Design a protein around this nucleic acid. Sequence first.
RNA 1: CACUGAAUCAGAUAAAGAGCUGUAA
RNA 2: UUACAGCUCUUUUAGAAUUUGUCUAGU
Lengths: 77, 81, 499, 76, 83, 114, 311, 106, 74, 510
Amino acid sequence: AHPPELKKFMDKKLSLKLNGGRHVQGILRGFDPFMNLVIDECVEMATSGQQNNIGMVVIRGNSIIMLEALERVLEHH
Amino acid sequence: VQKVMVQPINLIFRYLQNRSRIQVWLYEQVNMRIEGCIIGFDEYMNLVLDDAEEIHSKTKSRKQLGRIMLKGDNITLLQSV
Amino acid sequence: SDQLLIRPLGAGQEVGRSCIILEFKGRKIMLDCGIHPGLEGMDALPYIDLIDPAEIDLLLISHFHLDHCGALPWFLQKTSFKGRTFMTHATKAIYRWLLSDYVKVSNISADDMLYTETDLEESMDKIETINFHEVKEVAGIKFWCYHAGHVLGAAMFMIEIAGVKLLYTGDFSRQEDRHLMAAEIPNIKPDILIIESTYGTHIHEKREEREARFCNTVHDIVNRGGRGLIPVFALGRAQELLLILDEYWQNHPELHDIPIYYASSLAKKCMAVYQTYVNAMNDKIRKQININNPFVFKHISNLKSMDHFDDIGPSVVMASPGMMQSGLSRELFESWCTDKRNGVIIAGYCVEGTLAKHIMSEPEEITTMSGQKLPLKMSVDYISFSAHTDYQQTSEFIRALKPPHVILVHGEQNEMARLKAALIREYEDNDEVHIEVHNPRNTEAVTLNFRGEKLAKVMGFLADGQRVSGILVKRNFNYHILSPCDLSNYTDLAMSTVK
Amino acid sequence: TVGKSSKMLQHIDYRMRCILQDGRIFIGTFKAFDKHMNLILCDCDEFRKREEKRVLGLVLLRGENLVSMTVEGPPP
Amino acid sequence: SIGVPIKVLHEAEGHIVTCETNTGEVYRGKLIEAEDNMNCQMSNITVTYRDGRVAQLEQVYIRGSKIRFLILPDMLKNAPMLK
Amino acid sequence: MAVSHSVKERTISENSLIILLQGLQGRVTTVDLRDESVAHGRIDNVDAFMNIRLAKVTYTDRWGHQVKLDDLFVTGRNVRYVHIPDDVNITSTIEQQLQIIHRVRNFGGKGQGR
Amino acid sequence: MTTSERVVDLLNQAALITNDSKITVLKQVQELIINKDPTLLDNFLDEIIAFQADKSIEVRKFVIGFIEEACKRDIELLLKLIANLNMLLRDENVNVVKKAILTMTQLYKVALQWMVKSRVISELQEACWDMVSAMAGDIILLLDSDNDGIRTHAIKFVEGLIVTLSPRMADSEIPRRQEHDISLDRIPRDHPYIQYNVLWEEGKAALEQLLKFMVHPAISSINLTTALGSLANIARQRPMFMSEVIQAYETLHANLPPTLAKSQVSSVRKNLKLHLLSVLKHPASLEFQAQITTLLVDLGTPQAEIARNMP
Amino acid sequence: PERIQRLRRLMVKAPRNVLTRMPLHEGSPLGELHRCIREGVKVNVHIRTFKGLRGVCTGFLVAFDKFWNMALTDVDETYRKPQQVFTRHINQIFIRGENVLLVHLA
Amino acid sequence: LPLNPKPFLNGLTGKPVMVKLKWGMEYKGYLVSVDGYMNMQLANTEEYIDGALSGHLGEVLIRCNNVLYIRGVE
Amino acid sequence: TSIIKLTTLSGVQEESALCYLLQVDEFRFLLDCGWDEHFSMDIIDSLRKHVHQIDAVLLSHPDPLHLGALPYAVGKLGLNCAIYATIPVYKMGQMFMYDLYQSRHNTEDFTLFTLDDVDAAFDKIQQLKFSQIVNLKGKGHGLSITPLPAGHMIGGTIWKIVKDGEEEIVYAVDFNHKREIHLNGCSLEMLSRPSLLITDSFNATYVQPRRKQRDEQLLTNVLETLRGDGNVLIAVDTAGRVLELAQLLDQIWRTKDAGLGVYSLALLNNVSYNVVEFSKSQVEWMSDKLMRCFEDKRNNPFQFRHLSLCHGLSDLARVPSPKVVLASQPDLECGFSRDLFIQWCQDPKNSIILTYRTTPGTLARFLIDNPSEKITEIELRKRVKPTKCISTTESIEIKARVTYIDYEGRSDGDSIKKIINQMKPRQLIIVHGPPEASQDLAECCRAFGGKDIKVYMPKLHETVDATSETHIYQVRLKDSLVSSLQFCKAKDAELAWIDGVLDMIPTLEP
RNA sequence: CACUGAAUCAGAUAAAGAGCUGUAA
RNA sequence: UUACAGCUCUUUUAGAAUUUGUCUAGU
Ligand SMILES: [Zn+2]
Ligand SMILES: [Zn+2]
């Protein structure tokens, strides 16, 4: 069970897409081989577009569909 | 400057020392959010909360629960309030 | 005082449970004690009750096969033996794991066990190690072992008791090998040869013709998309087969995609002995250790069990046991016998009553371990890899030494008697060489006379056709005759005076 | 996941009708698998549900999302 | 060792693929790196939502367990492993 | 009968209830799937992960459309019911399969096969 | 590369290792911040102690050994690392609590000596010592624990608790490794916070728990022969309790437990011979040669081995 | 024969199948479900649908598993297809424990 | 001082709990025993669906993957 | 009455080389030829006239002090005779000469011996094993050869010349009685009372500390330098005593509770990979404790999991910045042991641990005694032009912590003197060592020996006619041994007083 | 006709045991 | 004679809790 290669996303501004249509942004500060993320300065983008600063969070990796990059992230070949 | 990473087992354990009220978001259950204070957590992220309450987003009711043990399979986020 | 009694307590007119008592001038040497691999319980021991283990001086174990070292933890621990036992360095490192596998296979059999593994490990401290060609002395017995070939660590123990020089060859081979050397003809000619008689008057296919027929067999199986099963023993010829297939795939770039496996947990634990003891190899490997170890494989990996590898495309898996009683070499067969592309290669040997001997008659339908009947359609090829001597290598070995007395052990009674009949009619025409061949059975002693002049030395004050008077010291058999004055000069104890 | 008792090599390079959990039906040349039922199907079909057909090509199917495999026909 | 389809997915690193998640979104884009547990880093993504829309993204990273199937490029069907 | 050739796959079976429905390989059963589809055929070689490789099925979709097939392979996770036959006696066909594994795990020795 | 960038790289590495092989990486983090550059220990303290909540049991046993090696290097850090040592003592594993009792054995003498070197104390340091003494009294309650190993390490703790909380005399034979450790003679009695009379009765109340533990009928074998050597260490180092140890030796010698077999009854009888022979050399044992020499005859010791060790 | 006694004068685990794991689990909820094997208690198993409840099986219990897999025999299942209750009788069933919701006892 | 979840259930056996399942089903009763996977055996169990009493079931053995939270009720 | 004479060709009065010429009845054993560190020609001209009265060159311990002249004595001086040496002398002594050529070929135009002379001298060599009695065939007929373990380096031998009879001419130089980590000690009890012993007196006055006491001060010097963020240079051999320290260090770098593995062991030879690759092949040549831990646990004891081996300065720079390097040459004269000395002797946070006491004309003898700082020493480079070598001189200001810790495996003067006393050699010579310490060993073997010992202290180019008369003639007992009782070697078991006539080969008649 | 074999599941579960090697008293 | 680390073994028990080995989508 190899860990994720999320070192390219460290201290980058993510825009996470959780399950159930929930969507948060913020800056990654760490992870684990279960892909449980820690998101500093996390902003809750609600369904009505209302943004909510929710501090820094622990997001369980079981419910992370997709995480896009709002900043430039290194790529391999 | 490369900072040491904030692993997720640190920051849950940081709530345990601080006695800080958290607000759990639930896995595939958008309307209800458990809001308690961590007295203990497990290997599999089973949270023992205290003075916990269900926060229905549509009903706006705060059903007082008490000393519960939320399981790890249900957590999708750990907001700190 | 005068006679020499070679009493075969085992492997007399049989293969297995080897044991030879060597009694000459008060010293008893037991040569190469093992169990019989075809018997059960306490019957597999040699006839140890014909002697008492309290007065056996030496114990020279030739190599690590169970018919040559198997009865040893019973003998060193569970009897009244207090002598000194000797192996080579590479025998003892395989002995501890070869026999740890013995008490695991004899654990799922009947519970009248000979010994256990906690009785095996406390036997390792009583075993001393002789290196090759080095002269060790126990109770006045010089003995030094030669390279016997045939396995990694085997030995031909030359034994010299009072000028009578005997050679026990054990199981030896005289063909140059990929990882072994030929059996060494000594520069010292023995007075008594105790030689194996495993084949008698058989013959081998030539080595360049067997390894070509082997490599063409492995290559034709993987060209038709099939799987290659090579059932072989874990330690005898598995390691030599590996050198052939790894070398053969350095010489062929197209075969790099498919893989070669060896599937044994005994060959895993004993592969480090083949990587370490490079000085007991031949000259071909110990000059190739300058670049890289040839037992650190470049295209061959271990297979822990057949759950680990996916059976996608061709592969060559050489598992153990060799005669396919049970285990992983049997379940790889049953998974592969229902396809025409696959092919089994019986590289070792077979015994009547095993699956590897029943397959050679091409049965139409073999029986699974669970009782199911599977149609046998995979190709069967029998390619011998004997690592012993035929008649042209045993008779060449016995022309080079010319022993006055030859004792045949470690051979079945029909193939030992045909070897004695051939050795007698090979030396009944010429007159200057005389060989008296024996084939004694169990318990039947061979009485040989070796009367020799006793020679002493004066070197003290008596050293300068006159009279000789003084005190004489006998060390073990070496005599010295000295002055009464020269006990503080040569002898450790100088004098005795009371008032 | 799949162990060696279910011989998945029986139907290699065949044409396999694979029904997914959502209800879609993949029909393609069964190239390769693993111990997780990751299916390499070649020249695929996608039957949703009256029902529409889509041509996909070389589809890797995650083995969590497999319900039933059946044989459409011989190797074409 | 890893299986053949994971090795086949590593031989598609650097081509435009199609990924559909468990939630119904279809992700069309160049994939930069895929992992042994099918975690696919991708780039220059055209998405197609469950309700049916088109948005265009820059760089994503998809969890491997949240991928329903991957549509590999039709060039790749002549791989040395699929033969 | 037939057991697995994998120690990894026969000891998951020996320690679990799966060894039950490996005891009724060859009998016509009805396998109700997790998505409320019905598969009714002859069980052949169900593994340690309940991947049932049925033989000759009257497979029913979850909308009710019977499409009769000639081979079908059910995923282990997409199972809820295995309608085992009437003349089975559950605790005996478990003890028969545990007897078959016990004679494969030991299986005699040398000089005794023939 | 800088140590404060090598430690960060070894903590990003030890945060992604899943199995029990992270402690090879993680003991390297120990040796770089307490031995090579101890000034970084104040910086990376909050990231090592985060590994005490780990899934593995040897990672949280590393944290117990780390707090032991950081409080003996900087005892000022005990104000933070004592809230993280009781929850490793209240841990649900039993190999983890045995390591937490070993660490409380060394970090009680050092914690008490730190409380008396401070002539003035602070209220946050008041909250530390009553938390050390609360978890020192709970290891006494771990003599009633249902594990053989928890009871064994707790016996070796209360011998480090009796000797610490009972004063020295002129004939107190103390070894050269235990010389500068604190006793109850170098305590201050005019101290502000900690009190002499509280620790006076605390040292003998911990004795009474050790005494009645040994007259228990269901005491184990290796717990007994550790408690026999622990009564011999609180007699040679503290001759104030010489009248009480010999009373507990003869009570055990007249009343052995019948539950342990003869192959380990003779191991109790052998080791009881060794400690009574070793206590005889101590000069405060000459008062009670009517009891020690009486008991050694019943154990099977000749007169020559008794008469050789008389000082 | 006689020679084994001449050599003995020179001398100077349990099976772990599925059925042996049945009487275990005693300090657990699974071992209380072993009393239904012994005492013959009618067991009505709730079966999950994709999200919620599907039906109740109501059968005598034979031979359970770690995974809550179990072989009910005298089954009378009352279930609901996605309100139309359709009860059908099964003379012997195998329910895998992924689908079970809670084991009610009667 | 922290209170981990395995000491939480072991200090709650014999007491009235109210296990809420993942989809609104809720079962109060006397927690008898739990195991390492936290299967919850409940005795004298009555069912609360939608917060209202449905029916006294009896003895109820809830599988691990159904519990949302267990709550000590009084 | 064999004419046993030996001429000290070199290797006496602290010319710390070895080359001896022990004649046994017109059979010239050339015992143990070797160069010193800086290649003097005082042995080469002393071996021009003895390169044709020579046969059976008997080597010893693998190092250039015992086999260094042998690539030059074979490739240039042309001796065609048998060269008897054991297998680790063959495989590690070849490894010294590939790290004596190349360690100077990186710095200077070195053309004394080429690598084609190392191969030529190490192909005409007969690999022996310990206690392998080798009977010579030719102009020396009654002479047998027996190597016995010495314990200094791997496969280090003492020899045992035996003439037909009991003329026993044991050559025991630089031996070691203690059982160290990767070697077991020398026996010297299979030989009992010899006719001649050729021993050294290099440590005859040396009071050696305990091995447990000097493993602590190594570990104290290694740790305190590394905790202060500084490299450690260790000057060892390239195959002989580097196997002791790389086994001493790696069992400490494994089995300490702290995280030692952050500090990056190295092992700089030019041929360093083959050093550990051959030492993990001669496991049957090592200590019994070290051999039993292979035969019971299948771990090769030279399978190092912390020694990051390096072949040059380019491979050395790719390890983390604090490091413990054990250098190529024990003297600081050539190789990377000099190059790493000059790079970090100017930095006070570094340590330099000299482990071997070399010849007195060397830079590493200048640092063991007389510790000075502002000293002048040459610098030998080789720049890119095809290259060209540079010689230049510098003042270096040694301010690293230089410490000599004695890791040469030799016996001290209370055991190099006890073994000769526990033996009873009928003749003794004392053959290398200073004149201060050769007299200290001569005036105890003459004193606490017998009236007939006759020790020698020969000077350089001095022969010693060490042949003593104990005329021996071989009589075979003819008729009876029955009326006697024939007692044994152990104790007074019986009594064997025997009279008799002769018949002059002769016999004995009552 | 030449002499034995994957010990009841994953390259790391948990309690209680063992033996060797080393180093601290 | 005690206590800690390093590797090799023996019974008991786990191998049903987040990326495929026992389901909050099967919309
Ligand atoms: Zn053999
Ligand atoms: Zn044989």
